[PDB]
Design an enzyme around this catalytic site. Structure first.
Site, mmCIF file in Angstrom:
data_model
loop_
_atom_site.group_PDB
_atom_site.id
_atom_site.type_symbol
_atom_site.label_atom_id
_atom_site.label_comp_id
_atom_site.label_asym_id
_atom_site.label_seq_id
_atom_site.Cartn_x
_atom_site.Cartn_y
_atom_site.Cartn_z
ATOM 1 N N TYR A 53 -6.511 -1.411 2.228
ATOM 2 C CA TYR A 53 -6.452 0.021 2.158
ATOM 3 C C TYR A 53 -5.796 0.474 0.773
ATOM 4 O O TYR A 53 -5.720 1.596 0.614
ATOM 5 C CB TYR A 53 -5.880 0.549 3.121
ATOM 6 C CG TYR A 53 -6.197 0.236 4.478
ATOM 7 C CD1 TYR A 53 -5.494 -0.849 5.194
ATOM 8 C CD2 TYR A 53 -7.064 1.163 5.276
ATOM 9 C CE1 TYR A 53 -5.989 -1.212 6.494
ATOM 10 C CE2 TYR A 53 -7.411 0.579 6.658
ATOM 11 C CZ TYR A 53 -6.842 -0.643 7.263
ATOM 12 O OH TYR A 53 -7.395 -1.146 8.449
ATOM 13 N N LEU A 54 -5.811 -0.468 -0.232
ATOM 14 C CA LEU A 54 -4.901 -0.259 -1.314
ATOM 15 C C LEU A 54 -5.777 0.973 -2.117
ATOM 16 O O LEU A 54 -5.545 1.977 -2.332
ATOM 17 C CB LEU A 54 -5.081 -1.472 -2.309
ATOM 18 C CG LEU A 54 -4.184 -2.674 -1.704
ATOM 19 C CD1 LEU A 54 -4.111 -3.661 -2.870
ATOM 20 C CD2 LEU A 54 -2.804 -2.313 -1.246
ATOM 21 N N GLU B 81 -8.882 3.841 -2.799
ATOM 22 C CA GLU B 81 -9.763 4.546 -2.136
ATOM 23 C C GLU B 81 -10.786 5.245 -3.051
ATOM 24 O O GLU B 81 -10.201 5.874 -4.204
ATOM 25 C CB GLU B 81 -8.645 5.647 -1.724
ATOM 26 C CG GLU B 81 -7.242 5.903 -2.250
ATOM 27 C CD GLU B 81 -6.201 5.146 -1.487
ATOM 28 O OE1 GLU B 81 -4.809 5.486 -1.981
ATOM 29 O OE2 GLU B 81 -6.440 4.392 -0.767
ATOM 30 N N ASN C 103 0.851 -1.229 -0.068
ATOM 31 C CA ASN C 103 -0.121 0.094 -0.116
ATOM 32 C C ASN C 103 0.779 1.213 0.070
ATOM 33 O O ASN C 103 0.107 2.509 -0.061
ATOM 34 C CB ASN C 103 -0.932 0.064 1.189
ATOM 35 C CG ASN C 103 -2.033 1.227 1.081
ATOM 36 O OD1 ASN C 103 -2.873 1.326 0.322
ATOM 37 N ND2 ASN C 103 -1.339 2.317 2.178
ATOM 38 N N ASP D 222 0.847 -6.781 3.159
ATOM 39 C CA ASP D 222 0.703 -5.881 4.399
ATOM 40 C C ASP D 222 -0.176 -4.641 3.946
ATOM 41 O O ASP D 222 -0.079 -4.217 2.939
ATOM 42 C CB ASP D 222 2.045 -5.281 4.862
ATOM 43 C CG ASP D 222 1.926 -4.183 5.544
ATOM 44 O OD1 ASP D 222 1.917 -4.342 6.807
ATOM 45 O OD2 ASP D 222 2.246 -2.880 5.031
ATOM 46 N N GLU E 10 -2.520 -9.813 6.048
ATOM 47 C CA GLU E 10 -3.133 -9.377 7.226
ATOM 48 C C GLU E 10 -4.397 -8.358 6.758
ATOM 49 O O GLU E 10 -4.044 -7.213 6.155
ATOM 50 C CB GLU E 10 -2.042 -8.247 7.489
ATOM 51 C CG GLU E 10 -2.156 -7.532 8.932
ATOM 52 C CD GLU E 10 -1.329 -6.249 8.945
ATOM 53 O OE1 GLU E 10 -1.289 -5.507 8.015
ATOM 54 O OE2 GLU E 10 -0.831 -6.130 10.147
ATOM 55 N N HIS F 109 3.940 -8.653 16.514
ATOM 56 C CA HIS F 109 4.829 -7.226 16.831
ATOM 57 C C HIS F 109 4.162 -6.343 16.710
ATOM 58 O O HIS F 109 4.700 -4.891 17.060
ATOM 59 C CB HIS F 109 5.900 -7.268 15.480
ATOM 60 C CG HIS F 109 5.334 -6.831 14.220
ATOM 61 N ND1 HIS F 109 4.364 -7.880 13.321
ATOM 62 C CD2 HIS F 109 5.111 -5.627 13.279
ATOM 63 C CE1 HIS F 109 4.042 -7.122 12.368
ATOM 64 N NE2 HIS F 109 4.382 -5.675 12.128
ATOM 65 N N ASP F 110 2.865 -5.976 16.719
ATOM 66 C CA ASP F 110 1.951 -4.990 16.865
ATOM 67 C C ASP F 110 1.207 -4.929 18.096
ATOM 68 O O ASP F 110 1.275 -5.759 19.053
ATOM 69 C CB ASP F 110 0.982 -4.853 15.605
ATOM 70 C CG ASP F 110 1.554 -4.090 14.569
ATOM 71 O OD1 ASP F 110 1.832 -2.800 14.771
ATOM 72 O OD2 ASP F 110 1.459 -4.639 13.161
HETATM 73 CA CA LIG Z 1 -3.772 3.254 -0.604
#
Ligand SMILES: [Ca+2]
Ligand SMILES: [Ca+2]
Ligand SMILES: [Mg+2]
Ligand SMILES: [Mg+2]
Lengths: 548, 548
Positions: free
Chosen positions: A208-209, A211, A100, A204, A246, A313-314
């Site tokens: 949200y790629l 919009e 992204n 990852d 994810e 890790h988050d």
């Molecule tokens: Ca994006």
């Protein structure tokens, strides 16, 4: 049955696992020395966090070259040797594909910010690589994911005199997936590594790629159209290899990322929605939250397989829960303010369970006994803690603690000079918590974990079975079955801190003898109307077989 | 009800507990500074090993002066304030009293070995304190206890030019109890400490006091009379104080040492035979032996009470079992030849049970749920280990591990300088096992143990209730009831390392609901015939109450 279905994954940050040259930072030379440990623990796949060149502002999820190896970690040769050796040992390896966005230091963005058209008059190939705006008013009704840092999702580059989009940090500029040149740019990156023999990625920030104005900009179908392209690419060009998503989302949107039989998408998705209910049910002595969430999960494609995790890790993310649950979690698991960050809790597994062996073994059994492939987070097999005095999510990303020598064996440099300082406190410090100790302690958590993995290894119904909840008559007891290939397992677990009584509804199994998976000690045979009574100690787990 | 009946004893050695001045030896001032530790731990009485002046041939049971304190440990004043500070915190303290013999370094014996009369003609009061023979031939038909070092029970002194009687090491000459002056001394020694406000005595080597021609010179009536004389005296002058017999004999041999309602003798005696059995039951997954030996306990006087333990300053004694039994034990608990000594096994508690927290708790609960005042041994509350690199039973007499500083908090002396060296190994070493860690850790063994002593303390039925074994229908599960004062306790324990199922015969309690002593969570009520089915996890313990 594909390899990723029977696999046990283990997640690690190269930079923090084992340093091999005293510079105070993990590296591939050091990781390569430790491959024996991982293998004999019972790990089949490593998943390494990003390893690329990068100014490291989101710990190298801000990528500045997709075909690199961050100087810190060694060279492309080291990497190849690492890979060759993992493979030699029967280990698979996957990495993180950051799709992204890139760092603001990527040459791409350095060109983009020049202007829409080059000073010599001609046009700029790289400006339509990113996502720009004049006023910066589009996509309100869009959440700000880094709430404790970012006040907006448009920021003002001076060199370009316009606004650019970023779901994440200001220095992590979002990539324009409407430009098909950009889709080819990332197709390159994945080819690059796949050619070297890498066995897959975790991809990852995939919701949200794309919009669209007037939507939330998450889980859009165009987004999915793109991903479909990548899996197409891999299904053709590199048979066998794994794609792992994810997606921190509610359960109806999460399933969508598997695609359909006819339009396959990801091989695997993380089960984000089960993981908080695990902690919640613990504190409430009420497993209902778990049953509902699993009961809201549709069948996935033949090829799909869930990915099960406790921590990573988050921060323990609480974004995708009701407000009432969120507040309850924070009070029960994050009493101090610095324990919170963004919409989540930034703590390691053991501190969350107040260092309680019993509760820890419990929640690992349920990690193993559910449908999926489990992923361990590094250090949790020995019961590592956290350093909340480190910024952002760095407190769960301390160095692996190998022994009680300098910096706990991670490095010959003093703690002060390590990149993240190894935990030194009286409870979770490397003095007391470390691998070398637990390879000598007969009852250690590490031995326990090796020994339970092996137990799961010997029963495939864990990896491949169906699932079906049982009636316990008591919310604190949670029971279910797993059947596969003539094997019927019965997993009962008590989420209460004291003894608890159930009545198990084993009507379907009348006439069958239950026995312990470990030693086949016999339990009374189901009879009558098949209402089996049980009592269970605090935080017990019964792992059972039903024989016809 | 008499204080000693409700109390939890705790055995330590001053020399090894805490060092106040850095000489590398524990001492009273150091001990004084740890009294809050012990108060908070939950214990009620401190049993101290021998603090008397001694050459230390036989670990300070060879006494040079019954009315002083060894100089390694402090001064008579140091002791008086330790005592004033214990008391101020509601702790009783008792001491070791060695009655049958003194050291050859006692003034008495140095003065006794001149001859029956002095160089000034006049007679020698102290010749008759010891036991002399001209040819040294009487008392064949009596054994040499220490068969290893000693040949004879008479040894030639050249200065006196005669033989003296000693049951033990030849530097431990028998006191002559047919001489009335000596009975006076015994009473005066006891009065010295009782004046200071010492609360009692462990009384050592009673069976061997008087010796007669033609007998075993053991458990003789004459010796019983002295102890009655002794008991009588304390009742008159210092009421409320405790006299406990050290004495390793079967329980029906020992009852006599309580005396009778009419003629009291000892307030408490040890029960040895169950101790090995708890260990064996664990590894045979079978509890018959425990039932059987509590079954064979004689009645004891009103004031009487049994004392009961797990480990201590000595080796796990296997004298009191069958040969076949002794073999099983060595096979299961003593793989290494060098863990054997003297019909026993020379290992601490956590090592004996493979450092397995579950087994360790399992066994402590049973110790505490059974009738008898329990005595705990310093260091086992934190799961200390052993050093077989030290001779005899010094392996289990290592310094207490307070923190992870120099010498693990015991001394400022480096480890090599300490009286015995503190343990540093990977598993049980003070870098990993200590008080500072365990107080800071919400789920430590140390905290658990305090929880549990609190739980015992809240239910008098543990101190004063009767005992009644129930059926279960499965050996690995051990169930019994305690009753006193309306309250009825039901304590069920699992000795197998995997799940087990039972059918508890609760017929006498139908219409009654058992409930958890911890958080009072209730169970199904007892119904029908009263057969109550249960299931238990590996090494579970269920502490329950029955309500009407
Ligand atoms: Ca994006
Ligand atoms: Ca004698
Ligand atoms: Mg390095
Ligand atoms: Mg000293």
């Amino acid at each position: 049955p594909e390899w990723y279905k029977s696999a046990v994954f283990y997640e690690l940050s190269v930079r923090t696992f084992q340093d091999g040259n005293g510079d105070g930072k993990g590296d591939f030379p050091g990781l390569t020395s430790r491959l024996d440990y991982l293998k004999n623990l019972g790990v089949d796949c490593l998943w390494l966090l990003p390893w690329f060149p990068s100014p490291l502002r989101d710990d190298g999820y801000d990528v500045a070259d997709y075909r690199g190896i961050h100087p810190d970690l060694g060279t492309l040769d080291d990497f190849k040797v690492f890979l060759r050796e993992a493979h030699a040992r029967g280990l698979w390896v996957i990495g993180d594909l950051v799709t992204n966005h890139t760092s603001s230091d990527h040459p791409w963005f350095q060109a983009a910010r020049r202007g829409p058209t080059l000073p010599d008059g001609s046009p700029n190939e790289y400006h339509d690589y990113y996502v720009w705006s004049d006023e910066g008013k589009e996509y309100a009704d869009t959440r700000i994911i880094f709430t404790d840092t970012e006040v907006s999702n448009w920021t003002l580059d001076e060199q370009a005199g316009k606004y650019y989009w970023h779901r994440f940090f200001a220095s992590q500029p979002d990539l324009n997936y409407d430009n098909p040149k950009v889709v080819e740019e990332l197709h390159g990156a994945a080819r690059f590594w796949l050619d070297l023999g890498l066995d897959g990625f975790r991809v990852d920030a995939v919701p949200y790629l794309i919009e669209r104005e007037g939507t939330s900009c998450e889980n859009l179908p165009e987004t999915h159209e793109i991903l479909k392209g990548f899996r197409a690419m891999v299904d053709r060009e590199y048979p066998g290899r794994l794609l792992l998503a994810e997606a921190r989302q509610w359960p109806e949107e999460v399933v969508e990322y598997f695609g359909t039989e006819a339009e396959p998408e990801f091989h695997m998705c993380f089960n984000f929605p089960v993981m908080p209910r695990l902690y919640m049910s613990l504190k409430r002595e009420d497993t209902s939250s778990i049953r509902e969430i699993m009961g809201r999960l549709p069948k996935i494609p033949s090829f799909g397989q869930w990915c099960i995790f406790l921590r990573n890790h988050d921060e323990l993310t609480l974004e995708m829960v009701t407000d009432d649950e969120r507040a309850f979690m924070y009070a029960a698991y994050a009493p101090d303010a610095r324990m919170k960050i963004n919409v989540g809790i930034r703590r390691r597994l053991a501190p969350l369970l107040d260092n309680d062996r019993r509760r820890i073994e419990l929640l690992n059994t349920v990690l193993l006994a559910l449908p999926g492939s489990p992923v361990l987070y590094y250090g949790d097999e020995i019961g590592m803690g956290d350093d909340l005095g480190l910024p952002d999510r760095n407190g769960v990303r301390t160095p692996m603690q190998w022994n009680a020598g300098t910096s706990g064996g991670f490095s010959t440099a003093q703690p002060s000079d390590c990149f993240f300082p190894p935990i030194q406190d009286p409870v979770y410090g490397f003095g007391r918590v470390n691998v070398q100790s637990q390879l000598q302690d007969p009852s250690s958590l590490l031995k326990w974990t090796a020994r339970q993995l092996e137990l799961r290894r010997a029963h495939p119904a864990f990896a491949h079975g169906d699932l079906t909840f049982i009636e316990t008559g008591n919310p604190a007891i949670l029971a279910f079955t797993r059947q596969y290939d003539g094997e019927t397992l019965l997993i009962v677990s008590n989420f209460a801190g004291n003894a608890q009584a159930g009545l198990l509804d084993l009507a379907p199994f009348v006439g069958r003898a239950p026995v312990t998976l470990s030693g086949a000690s016999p339990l009374p045979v189901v009879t009558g109307n098949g209402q089996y009574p049980v009592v269970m100690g605090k935080y017990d787990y019964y792992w059972l077989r039903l024989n016809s």
